[PDB]
Amino acid sequence: KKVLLKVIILGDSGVGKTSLMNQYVNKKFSADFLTKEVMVDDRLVTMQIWDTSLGVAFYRGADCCVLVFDVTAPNTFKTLDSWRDEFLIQASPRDPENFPFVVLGNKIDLENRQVATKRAQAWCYSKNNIPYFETSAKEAINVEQAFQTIARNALKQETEVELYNE
Numbered sequence: 001k002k003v004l005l006k007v008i009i010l011g012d013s014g015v016g017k018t019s020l021m022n023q024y025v026n027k028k029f030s031a032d033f034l035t036k037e038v039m040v041d042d043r044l045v046t047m048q049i050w051d052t053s054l055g056v057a058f059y060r061g062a063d064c065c066v067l068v069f070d071v072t073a074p075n076t077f078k079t080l081d082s083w084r085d086e087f088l089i090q091a092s093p094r095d096p097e098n099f100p101f102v103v104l105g106n107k108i109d110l111e112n113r114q115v116a117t118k119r120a121q122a123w124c125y126s127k128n129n130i131p132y133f134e135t136s137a138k139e140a141i142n143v144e145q146a147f148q149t150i151a152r153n154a155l156k157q158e159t160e161v162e163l164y165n166e
C-alpha cells in the first residue's frame with residue numbers, strides 16, 4: 001500500500017495559489033493537480049496538490065485544506081471565514097475543529113503589506129490553532145517550510161482515515 005495525500009488550495013483569485021503550487025513543486029515562478037514525493041520524518045508520501053462547482057467528492061477526499069490570502073489585500077483576508085466554512089460544508093469532516101487547515105499569507109515580498117501578521121495569527125489561533133505561514137511564491141520565501149507542514153498534517157489526517165477506516 002502506498003501513501004497518497006490529497007491537498008486542495010482555496011482562496012480569492014489573484015492571491016497566489018497557482019504560483020505557490022508551482023514554486024513548491026517545480027521551483028519556478030511565472031480542476032487540475034501536481035504531484036510531489038515528499039519525506040515526512042522517515043516516511044515517503046506522494047502529495048497530490050489540487051488547484052482551484054467542483055462537486056462534493058472533490059472536497060470530501062481532501063487530507064488538508066490550504067487557505068491563501070494576499071497580505072497586501074485586506075479583502076482576501078476577510079473572505080477566509082467564507083472559504084473555511086464552505087470547505088466544511090462541502091467536505092463534511094467528522095471532527096470539524098480538528099480537520100487540518102493551513103493558512104498562507106502570501107506576497108510578503110511586497111513591503112507595503114496591509115494585513116498585520118498578528119491579526120492573521122489571531123484569526124488562525126481562534127479556529128483551534130490553525131498553522132499559519134507567511135510566504136512569497138515570487139521569491140521562494142517559506143514555501144518549502146509551509147508545504148512540509150502541509151504534508152505532515154495531511155499525513156496525520158490520512159493516517160486517521162486509514163486506521164479507523166473513516
Ligand SMILES: Nc1nc2c(ncn2[C@@H]2O[C@H](COP(=O)(O)OP(=O)(O)O)[C@@H](O)[C@H]2O)c(=O)[nH]1
Binds near residue numbers: 011015016136
Ligand atoms: N509579488 C508577488 N506576486 C505574486 C506572488 N505570488 C503570486 N504573485 C502574482 O500575483 C498574480 C496572481 O497569482 P496567481 O498565482 O495566478 O494566483 P491565483 O489566481 O490565486 O491562482 C500573478 O500576477 C503572480 O505573478 C508573490 O509571492 N509575490
Ligand SMILES: [Mg+2]
Binds near residue numbers: 017018052
Ligand atoms: Mg490560479
